[model samples]
Target chain A: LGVEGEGIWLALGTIGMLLGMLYFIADGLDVQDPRQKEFYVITILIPAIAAASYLSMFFGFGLTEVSLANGRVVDVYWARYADFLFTTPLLLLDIGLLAGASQRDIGALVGIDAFMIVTGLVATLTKVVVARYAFWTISTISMVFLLYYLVAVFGEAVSDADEDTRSTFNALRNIILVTWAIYPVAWLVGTEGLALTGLYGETLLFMVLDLVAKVGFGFILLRSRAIMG
Target chain B: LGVEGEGIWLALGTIGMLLGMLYFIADGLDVQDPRQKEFYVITILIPAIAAASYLSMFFGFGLTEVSLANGRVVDVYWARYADFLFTTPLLLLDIGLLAGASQRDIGALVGIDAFMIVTGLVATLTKVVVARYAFWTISTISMVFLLYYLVAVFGEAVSDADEDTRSTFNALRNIILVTWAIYPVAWLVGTEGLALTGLYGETLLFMVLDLVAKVGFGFILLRSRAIMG
Candidate 1:
């Protein structure tokens, strides 16, 4: 059951994560100003690269296991190359184009810069844990349910014929279906709630982070450039 | 299954008829000429009243069996009152508002008057069908699945450990869930598609209907009023 549940979760989560990454890159490139543009590009690309690396590790681990079990020489050479495709250079080019068109203030860009850094770190950690623990938990739970079902079937056969016996059998069947349905609903609800909260929380956090980054680091950069000139 | 399905279709058809009546009143009331307004008010109200009466009779006959079986006293009283409510002065009041408003041509009273009318009609029809079919289908399907489950447990003992047994059970359960979910999706899609078509259809239909009612009957009313003046 856990295996089935985690399998479904991973399938859907990958799609959602890709969409989030696209929106982040597309919106991040809309920022202007050369100095702030450099900061924004770095912020967006750093997290994206981390996510891509994590995804590469996932596929690499899966492919290695499959090859070892089958004792076959399977080629997955392209999986290693994905990290380069999703890195900072791509983001920098996008930001450069926008910066050339219009200038952005230091304050606006700092918020997004900090957000990408924090989210990227957290996502990298979570992906590692999910890849490790998901399969184990799924296998354990499925075995437990299968064992219980077998026990119940044998127990029912030996039991006396009565209303109570019939009711017990009915209740056991319902429990199985209800338990299976609950996992999907819980996963969906949890993901949606967390994603929404994270989105809004990140926005607010960036606002605060931007104020600090701009007033502190930003002033230093401006002062040094002015003194040098 | 057919009885419940037919009930839903009939309920939807009744709601559509009511919506058309409301649209005719609301649109017909936008005319400027007093004689034309009077002619349209009468023409629109006559069909509306006739349709309302027919619907009331249909609902009355349909619910009678349910009320008799349940020995539901309050339901009987409500049914009698519901019939009267649809057929009486309520219809007159609805028609009167349209006629009074049409003479003033209160187009500027609201922003996007025509669009609002279209949205209003669509919303009313959607609400009625969703409330009637969507809610009932969900409840009925749940009940059916539960009953099937109870029978599978108590009514029979499966000595054969066959794959087909589990496959058949899952197939039946999935069909129930899928069919129940389809109704709301259909209702939403159908309402949107029909509204777009109805906008063009109503525009042409109203022009022909109003022209026949106003030019043919309205000229006589105007000439009589002028002679008295």
Candidate 2:
């Protein structure tokens, strides 16, 4: 039921997060503005949460074994979903602020986004196949609303911004849109969903998505002219 | 070996393409310019081909059943990959033309993209598990290069365009990156790959992706200022 070579990926994820933190910190060394520091702190914390989660996953503290219908047990890493639950909102916040979204808008977005994650966690932990799909449906529907807000609602706000803000906002928004969409696919194929993918493939797939979602997102956010100011 | 509800999805897919075609045609009524009409034609064909493919699949003409290792047979719809091989290039050409990508660069991009699809088909057809993965790896590597060209290479070309062009290019480019990335996941879960997904799930997954990749993409392309010009 254990995931072999998981240590390698967990260590790599930890390193990736640390590297992201270092990059944001070093890059922000020139920023004297307090407002700009807000971006730095959020960006740093995004990956910091992931690094700790990956470490926990590495030490075998973040996983539970589940039996499949065929009586085969696979390791499900609830820790990564824990990381996402905490950090996804931060990631959304980073983009929401950059897009100059309203406080109400951001609040609503976070609520729906967290709801999606929580439901996803429930879907993962569910033993009943039919119930898991029901949770997945609920979670996916939440994602649709979340994306509508992110693209349609926030996009309307960013549209009125300066050219740089509009450009940066679109780029970051696209990253979230594209990367986040893959999570459901992963969930569908992984042990808790279809069991089409073994633990190794599932683990690596989530890890790649995480690095891009957290670390890659932070790199782009910090480099954006909207945030750099 | 037969999919129970495949006709429903195939019909829905066919309807989706026809709707996309109708929208593009009706919208392009005001577009008299020959160059603008080129965008309309490509966008129209993008879905038209898919409509035909889905129609064929609906009639069970596009399916070929294959035996799994456990001696269970599953339907492999090579027709969809056939649709992709023909349409994906058109999709790329639609974006490439709008982006004003160089002929040489566009040629290279299409070549690699075609290679990726062809290898994917081979991977699907190959019954040998190890060899199937080898093809998948090769195909995925080709996809990496394809994405690089789309994002980095074509992105540079579009960078010099007007603000509207830049925004339109990024939006369209993001669609390609995000949608194209899911094809591999579908492959991994579908019958030909990991068989983690049943025929219904696999068919529905591929169908949904097809609609997004072809229909949704063409909608955005035709709507973009760069193409609207």
DockQ of each model against the real complex?
A: 0.01, 0.02
Residue-wise lDDT of candidate 1 within A1-229, one digit each (tens)?
A: 1211232322333343344446546654655656555545454454445445434443444222113222333222232234423432333233222222122322232333233333332322232434322332332233233323323332344245355434433343333333422332222222211222332232233223322222222223222321121
Model 1 misplaced stretches (Cα beyond 4 Å): A1-43, A50-52, A59-229, B1-8, B11-171, B183-229
The lowest-lDDT stretch of 10 consecutive residues in candidate 2 chain A is A66-75
- State the displacement of the C-alpha of residue B43, model 2, in Å, after optimal TM-score superposition: 0.5
Please state what fraction of the native interface contacts candidate 1 reproduces.
Answer: 0.00
Q: Is model 2 an incorrect, acceptable, medium or high docking prediction? A: incorrect
DockQ of 1: 0.01
* Tens-digit per-residue lDDT, A155-203, candidate 2: 9878888999898888888888898999998888877766787667777
Superposed Cα deviation of residue A110, candidate 1 (Å): 16
lDDT of 1 by residue, B96-201 (tens): 2322333122232222222323332333233232232323323333333233322343113321324443333333334333442342233333322223232223
lDDT of each: 0.33, 0.82
TM-score per candidate, chains pooled: 0.22, 0.52
